[PDB]
Amino acid sequence: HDEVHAVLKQLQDILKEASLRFTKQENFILDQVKGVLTLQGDALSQADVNLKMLLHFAFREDKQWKLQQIQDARNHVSQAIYLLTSGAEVLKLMDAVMLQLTRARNRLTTPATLTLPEIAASGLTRMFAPALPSDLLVNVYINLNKLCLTVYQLHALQPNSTKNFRPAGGAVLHSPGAMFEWGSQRLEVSHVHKVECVIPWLNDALVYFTVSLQLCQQLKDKI
């Protein structure tokens, strides 16, 4: 059997192209909310958010917000390459490479489950100039190939309220009516505005992962 080395070469070529995707388009335009986000590798370098009530919020231009899903995916790809560039032996190599690839895909596919207090306390909240008002939260994450911006409008519970208060748990996206404690207040999500844009090089990366995983499984099956 010699096809093992051919497969290892094809994997190295593909994954190096995939790695190049993480290291063209940078500016992305994201109905109630209009965003202009600049994405450089794993760094959200600028975020120009306009909410229709237009309230305008922007990052301070010094600072950048890292998207952990992209950084992690990048490191998984880099490690798949390292495993390659460094019978049952072939199968163990294939399992280790496929493990890195499936982790890279999963990190892009599965954004964090956060509580509303976690969103409010995130450094992302404090990225904005001028500061967000107390009745607005901003969340940003990657959903497979999409850059996703969520803006939550909040409403405090009124005095002598008849409403039942049950604190929301964690969620990727919270629904209107979700409630949480913040400081001396109990707040309800009144509105959820979600805008998203496809990131072409992320889609390219995902396709490369799919191809690579298929090539690994093909080789495993021949042994």
Residue numbers in the entry: 24 to 46, 57 to 63, 69 to 91, 97 to 129, 139 to 275
Q: What do the authors of the reporting publication say about this deposited model?
A:
Rogdi is the human homolog of Drosophila melanogaster rogdi, and is a predicted leucine zipper protein of unknown function. The human Rogdi protein comprises 287 residues, and is highly conserved among species including fish, fly, frog, worm, and mouse. The crystal structure shows that Rogdi resembles a boomerang with an elongated curved structure comprising two distinct α and β domains. The α domain consists of four helices (H1 to H3, and H6) that form a left-handed four-helix bundle through van der Waals interactions.
However, we were unsuccessful in producing full-length selenomethionine (Se-Met) derivatized protein, due to poor protein expression in the methionine auxotrophic bacteria. Instead, Se-Met substituted Rogdi was produced and crystallized using N- and C-terminally truncated constructs (residues 11–276, referred to as tRogdi). The structure of tRogdi was determined by single-wavelength anomalous dispersion (SAD) and refined to 2.04 Å resolution. The structures of full-length and truncated Rogdi are almost identical, with a root mean square deviation (RMSD) of 0.8 Å for all Cα atoms. The N-terminal amino acids 48–55, which correspond to the direct linker between H1 and S1 in all molecules including tRogdi, RogdiH, and RogdiL, were not visible in the electron density map, indicating high flexibility.
